[PDB]
Scaffold this motif. Sequence first.
Motif, PDB file in Angstrom:
ATOM      1  N   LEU A   1      -2.488   3.617   4.232  1.00 54.87           N
ATOM      2  CA  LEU A   1      -3.767   3.581   4.943  1.00 54.87           C
ATOM      3  C   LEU A   1      -3.706   2.427   5.938  1.00 54.87           C
ATOM      4  O   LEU A   1      -2.967   1.472   5.719  1.00 54.87           O
ATOM      5  CB  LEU A   1      -4.946   3.294   3.996  1.00 54.87           C
ATOM      6  CG  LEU A   1      -5.512   4.289   2.983  1.00 54.87           C
ATOM      7  CD1 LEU A   1      -7.025   4.033   2.849  1.00 54.87           C
ATOM      8  CD2 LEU A   1      -5.250   5.721   3.430  1.00 54.87           C
TER       9      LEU A   1
ATOM     10  N   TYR B   1      -4.056   3.675  -3.268  1.00 58.47           N
ATOM     11  CA  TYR B   1      -5.121   3.827  -4.269  1.00 58.47           C
ATOM     12  C   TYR B   1      -6.445   4.324  -3.685  1.00 58.47           C
ATOM     13  O   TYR B   1      -7.200   5.041  -4.341  1.00 58.47           O
ATOM     14  CB  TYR B   1      -5.376   2.482  -4.962  1.00 58.47           C
ATOM     15  CG  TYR B   1      -4.223   1.996  -5.809  1.00 58.47           C
ATOM     16  CD1 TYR B   1      -3.947   2.591  -7.029  1.00 58.47           C
ATOM     17  CD2 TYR B   1      -3.406   0.958  -5.385  1.00 58.47           C
ATOM     18  CE1 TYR B   1      -2.893   2.172  -7.806  1.00 58.47           C
ATOM     19  CE2 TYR B   1      -2.342   0.527  -6.158  1.00 58.47           C
ATOM     20  CZ  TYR B   1      -2.091   1.140  -7.367  1.00 58.47           C
ATOM     21  OH  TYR B   1      -1.040   0.723  -8.148  1.00 58.47           O
TER      22      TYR B   1
ATOM     23  N   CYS C   1       0.814  -1.206   0.000  1.00 59.98           N
ATOM     24  CA  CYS C   1       0.000   0.000   0.000  1.00 59.98           C
ATOM     25  C   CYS C   1       0.857   1.270   0.000  1.00 59.98           C
ATOM     26  O   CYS C   1       0.524   2.261  -0.644  1.00 59.98           O
ATOM     27  CB  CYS C   1      -0.914   0.020   1.222  1.00 59.98           C
ATOM     28  SG  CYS C   1      -1.923   1.522   1.369  1.00 59.98           S
TER      29      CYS C   1
ATOM     30  N   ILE D   1      -4.190  -5.754   1.308  1.00 58.85           N
ATOM     31  CA  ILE D   1      -5.028  -6.104   2.442  1.00 58.85           C
ATOM     32  C   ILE D   1      -5.129  -7.611   2.652  1.00 58.85           C
ATOM     33  O   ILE D   1      -5.287  -8.373   1.696  1.00 58.85           O
ATOM     34  CB  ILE D   1      -6.427  -5.486   2.303  1.00 58.85           C
ATOM     35  CG1 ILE D   1      -6.312  -3.964   2.265  1.00 58.85           C
ATOM     36  CG2 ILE D   1      -7.309  -5.927   3.459  1.00 58.85           C
ATOM     37  CD1 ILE D   1      -7.613  -3.254   2.040  1.00 58.85           C
TER      38      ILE D   1
HETATM   39  S1  F3S Z   1      -3.118   0.558  -1.994  1.00 59.10           S
HETATM   40 FE1  F3S Z   1      -3.772   1.085   0.114  1.00 59.10          FE
HETATM   41  S2  F3S Z   1      -5.259   2.854   0.118  1.00 59.10           S
HETATM   42 FE2  F3S Z   1      -6.477   0.887   0.032  1.00 59.10          FE
HETATM   43  S3  F3S Z   1      -6.866   0.210  -2.124  1.00 59.10           S
HETATM   44 FE3  F3S Z   1      -4.924  -0.710  -1.385  1.00 59.10          FE
HETATM   45  S4  F3S Z   1      -5.034  -0.664   0.904  1.00 59.10           S
END
Ligand code: F3S
Length: 106
Positions: free
Chosen positions: A32, A13, A8, A54
């Motif tokens: 995040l 994203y 991430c 995730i």
């Molecule tokens: S890159 Fe990160 S901001 Fe959400 S869509 Fe994936 S966990």
Amino acid sequence: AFVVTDNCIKCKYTECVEVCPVDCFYEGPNFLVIHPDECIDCALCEPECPAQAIFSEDEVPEDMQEFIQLNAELAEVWPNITEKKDPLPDAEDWDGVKGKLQHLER
Ligand code: F3S
Ligand code: SF4
């Protein structure tokens, strides 16, 4: 009890936040995290992350175990994010790069 891991970082994203039923995502400058106590383990955000960052807590890779604890502590200090946003400007370049934890910003 889901967890945002390494990929991430530098991507962010934000595709994961819209599907979250309990709005338990918190945002950092380039990453995040999921608040462990608020998350109801609906698993809905997992397939939405383009960075495939995730994971269910019990499925967090061995080499990314640190992120479980990390999500919990940062969720305490970062602001809640409930709306999708544009990915970081160079998300595609960093998507797939390992060990991005070294680039994590508070
Ligand atoms: S890159 Fe990160 S901001 Fe959400 S869509 Fe994936 S966990
Ligand atoms: S598993 Fe469900 S409740 Fe937990 S962060 Fe993902 S979308 Fe939100």
